[PDB]
């Protein structure tokens, strides 16, 4: 057979009379197909041979249909016969969603009864968890049910028809608030009959429809796998829901054989109908002043709603703001915590006017700002608050008086959930609904109307697989809870929508639940404690090493000495520190030409044992360093020197620079210490560009060091760890104020994040820059070492106030280029700080005048306090360079450039100047 359209065709082996009948159906089918669009980028034009086959079988679906079904399944669904979604997304990734959903629909139209247990990798290995979304997940929620009805007709048409009759029967029960009805079938089948999104979003309407979406997704997950609800629910470890989905969760827990499942769906739908109608009757939303919504809109804000979502702020801060607004509002238009989606994700219920005033206060207090040049302790807080698409203040006192009415109305219809099989986690208290003295429906109604939602506490799961059946999908509850459980080993599957999988492959999808091959069907999110656990290992000689992602590459301990221009330019410190068996990167900052760098590298190579390897550190701020050092490193590598690593200092290079550094010069790994969230993003992009080349980060918080890109050591690596570990070749090591096992072990084992309430976040290694100064191998002067030791330290919380005074004998000073340097508060360093606070900060004209007026004072200060004295001084007396005889100039040059005790000049170039 030649079923074809454009440059695609499919071959079917048909019996003779069957071939005549198939030819009849084929000319009839091409009578309906459209012409090629020169790319198959149209609407009804198939873009794949199997898309054409699906169109053909769907046409017949309005003996040959079985043949086409079997041929299609054998040709394209290789063991994924029930998993047409997997094929659809295979087309999306390799071969848009409209045609993918169309092939899915045509296949499901064609199939016979699907009562066959699908091998979904043992349905994801038998902990299965079912979460249900709530209200406000998405604005255009109704199109979700539109596509659901259109494309899964054979599976949930019966359910939708049942819901339509149930709701049209429920309206006579009490009353109709529904100015445009609630007949869902008419709206779905006739697009013109459907009212506007505002009326659809009105709660008495929307709550039944959101229940419809959840129950439809559950019914699809049952029928596709051929699993009755009574046994699918058994497969689930437990189930719960958001602000609205908890009723669906308890109903699914009460599921049974299909006949009883329809009764369960009736119960859930009637309960949500009563909840929505009673809530709207108790608090009907009113007109909203147009000047007020205009003011809200012209400040980057959405339409005001009875719920306001605030992100990037803690419950305590958000609560303090509500207390201000409530103190200045009457009790009856107060704002209360409606739901706590996470530590930095909240939603607050109340009147839209009260929440608008709330948002005015929050906009006044917030900032737009490029605060990278501002210390972290004094940085203004950022947040992105917006109103959810909802028309009711759920979980607030406004609907509290609707509660008793809801229960009284429920008691008349026999609505009662008693026989729950799986646990249903309480959305507020977190416990199981099974162990409740009061009726389950009473508790759930009180939850949805009055009580808040501590979402994380409710979903304190101990499970591996979670699936969201609610509205929103990508914008729904699954993605929201995935952020809360990124690193705890939880895999969220969005079992309510088919789409191309995330480009970073973070949460699953309908295709992922329905896959049958146990490589994409079974997908586990990273559990950092387990997969980055600091392990131990032993060598043949018996030496014990700490096996991590960092120690594994180096073959030695995961405790490096970072590059240091003053401290790690000596040949001996590098050579002996390496001979101790610890990686150290010789800094180039003390070397100003390739000949000096080559001499130092040669000396270190000669002084280290065979089989050894060192690293080099280069500063990216100065292009001269790069242009003389990168060719030298390439030359030494082509020679075959033991240079193992290149650590690029402050300033992550561009993608092209990282590319040439990774390919041209053959290093084992590339140290790429960033100093900001953006710089970490650049490093991640470089690692993506080179997925196989190891890249050790060496991220430094700027709390300790020399030149510190001032940040916090915790927050950036708290919010970027998740994005850092989605990279097989990024190795995560961090320093910035580490000097002992006591303060490094929590970071190695990941326990450091417990205080922040994040999953354990193990670190591959740690770098020690300031702890190794006092080491005997370092050539820093003994008086300098005594000063380093005698200067006390500063706990982490108090580091950032070093800009103002000597925190533990260390202060921040401005560079010639403006970068801040942490320096011990010596007399010279304090003079430096005084000058860069009082003189160098002034404009040029004011700089010179102030320079003279305070030069009268600076000459003395340079003489008594700084490295560089005033050259004009003679025996004590302050003189200018003009008040100087040639003899005393020469004498001063001897005194200041030639060392008497060592009987040598400081430097040959100084001798040449003399």
């Amino acid at each position: 057979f030649q079923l074809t359209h454009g440059s695609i065709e499919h071959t079917l082996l048909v019996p003779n009379d069957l071939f005549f009948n198939y030819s009849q159906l084929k000319d009839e089918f091409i009578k309906t197909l459209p012409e090629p669009t020169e790319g198959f980028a149209g609407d009804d034009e198939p873009s794949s041979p199997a898309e054409l086959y699906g169109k053909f079988i769907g046409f017949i679906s309005n003996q040959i249909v079985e043949l086409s079904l079997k041929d299609f399944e054998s040709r394209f669904l290789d063991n994924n016969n029930d998993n047409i979604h997997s094929f659809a997304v295979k087309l999306l990734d390799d071969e848009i969603a409209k045609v993918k959903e169309n092939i899915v629909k045509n296949y499901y139209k064609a199939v016979k009864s699907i009562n066959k247990v699908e091998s979904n990798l043992l349905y994801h290995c038998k902990k299965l968890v079912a979460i249900f979304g709530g209200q406000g997940n998405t604005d255009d929620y109704f199109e979700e049910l539109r596509e659901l009805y259109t494309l899964y007709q054979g599976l949930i048409e019966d359910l939708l028809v049942s819901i339509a009759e149930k709701l049209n029967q429920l309206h006579p029960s009490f009353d109709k608030i529904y100015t445009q009805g609630l007949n869902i079938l008419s709206w779905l089948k006739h697009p013109e009959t459907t009212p506007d999104q505002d009326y659809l979003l009105s709660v008495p309407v929307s709550c039944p429809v959101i229940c419809v979406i959840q129950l439809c997704h559950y019914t699809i997950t049952c029928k596709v796998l051929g699993l009755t609800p009574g046994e699918f629910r058994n497969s689930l470890k437990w189930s719960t829901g958001h602000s609205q989905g908890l009723v669906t969760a308890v109903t699914i827990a009460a599921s049974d054989s299909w006949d009883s499942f329809l009764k369960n769906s009736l119960t859930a739908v009637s309960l949500l109908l009563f909840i929505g109608s009673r809530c709207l009757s108790t608090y009907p939303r009113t007109s909203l002043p147009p000047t007020m919504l205009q003011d809200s809109l012209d400040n980057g804000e959405g339409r005001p709603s009875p719920m306001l979502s605030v992100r990037d702020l803690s419950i305590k801060q958000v609560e303090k703001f509500i207390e201000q607004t409530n103190s200045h509002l009457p009790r009856e238009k107060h704002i209360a915590i409606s739901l706590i989606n996470g530590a930095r994700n909240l939603v607050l219920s109340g009147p839209p006017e009260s929440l608008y005033g709330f948002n005015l206060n929050l906009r006044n207090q917030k900032a737009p700002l490029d605060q990278s040049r501002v210390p972290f302790s004094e940085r203004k807080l950022k947040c992105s608050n917006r109103f959810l698409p909802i028309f009711a203040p759920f979980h607030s006192h406004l609907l509290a008086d609707a509660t008793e009415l809801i229960l009284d109305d429920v008691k008349e219809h026999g609505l009662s959930f008693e026989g729950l099989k799986i646990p249903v986690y309480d959305t507020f208290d977190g416990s199981d609904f099974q162990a409740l003295k009061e009726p389950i429906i009473d508790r759930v109604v009180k939850l949805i109307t009055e009580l808040p939602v501590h979402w994380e506490e409710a979903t304190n799961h101990k499970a591996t697989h979670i699936l969201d059946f609610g509205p929103g999908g990508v914008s729904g509850l699954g993605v929201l809870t995935h952020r809360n459980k990124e690193g705890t080993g939880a895999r969220i599957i969005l079992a309510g929508t088919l789409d191309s999988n995330p480009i970073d492959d973070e949460y699953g999808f309908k295709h992922e639940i329905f896959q049958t091959s146990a490589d994409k069907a079974i997908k586990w999110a990273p559990d950092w404690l387990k997969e980055l656990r600091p392990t131990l290992v032993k060598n043949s000689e018996g030496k014990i090493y700490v096996k991590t992602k960092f120690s594994q590459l180096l073959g030695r301990a995961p405790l490096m000495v970072a590059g240091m221009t003053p401290t790690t330019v000596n040949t001996d410190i590098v050579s002996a520190s390496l001979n101790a068996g610890y990686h150290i990167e010789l800094a180039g900052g003390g070397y100003f030409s390739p000949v000096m760098m080559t001499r130092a590298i040669d000396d270190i190579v000669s002084r280290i044992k065979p089989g050894y390897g060192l690293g080099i550190n280069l500063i990216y701020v100065n292009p001269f360093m790069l242009q003389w050092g990168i060719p030298l490193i390439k030359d030494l590598r082509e020679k075959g020197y033991p240079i193992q690593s290149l650590t690029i200092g402050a300033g992550v290079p561009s993608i092209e620079v990282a590319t040439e550094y990774i390919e041209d010069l053959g290093l084992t790994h590339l140290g790429l210490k960033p100093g900001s969230v953006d710089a970490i993003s650049q490093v991640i992009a470089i690692a993506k560009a080179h997925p196989t080349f190891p890249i050790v980060l060496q991220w430094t918080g700027g709390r300790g060091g020399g030149h510190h890109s001032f940040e916090d050591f915790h927050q950036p690596i708290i919010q970027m760890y998740s994005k850092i570990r989605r990279c097989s070749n990024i190795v995560l090591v961090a320093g910035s104020g580490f000097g002992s096992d006591e303060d490094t072990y929590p970071y190695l084992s990941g326990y450091w994040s417990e205080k922040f309430n994040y999953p354990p976040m193990p670190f591959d290694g740690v770098l020690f820059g300031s702890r190794v100064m006092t080491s005997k191998e370092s050539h820093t002067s003994l008086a300098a070492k005594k000063l380093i030791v005698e200067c006390k330290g500063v706990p982490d919380q108090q580091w950032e106030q070093t800009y103002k005074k000597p925190t533990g004998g260390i202060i921040t000073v401005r560079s010639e280029m403006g970068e801040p340097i942490h320096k011990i508060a010596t007399r010279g360093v304090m003079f430096w700080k005084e000058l860069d606070d009082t003189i160098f900060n002034l404009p040029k004209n004011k700089l010179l005048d102030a320079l003279n007026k305070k030069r009268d004072h600076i000459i003395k200060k340079l003489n008594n306090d700084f490295q560089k004295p005033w050259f004009g001084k003679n025996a004590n007396g302050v003189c200018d360079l003009q008040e100087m005889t040639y003899k005393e100039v020469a004498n001063r040059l001897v005194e200041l450039m030639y060392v008497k005790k060592s009987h040598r000049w400081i430097d040959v170039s100084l001798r040449n100047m003399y």
Binding site: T291, M292, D295, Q324, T325, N326, S327, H328, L329, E353, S354, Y356, G357, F358, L360, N361, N364
Partner: protein
């Protein structure tokens, strides 16, 4: 505007959160400068 300015900074120092919560859009106007707003002549 000797009184308009001090009324402005009074509401700023004392009634900022009050105005926010109650959704009060205070418009301080002076005959010297904001005459167009006084006479509704935008």
């Amino acid at each position: 505007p000797t009184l308009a300015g001090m009324a402005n900074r009074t509401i700023k120092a004392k009634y900022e959160s009050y105005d926010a919560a109650l959704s009060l859009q205070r418009q301080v106007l002076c005959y010297s400068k904001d005459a167009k707003e006084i006479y509704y002549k935008p």
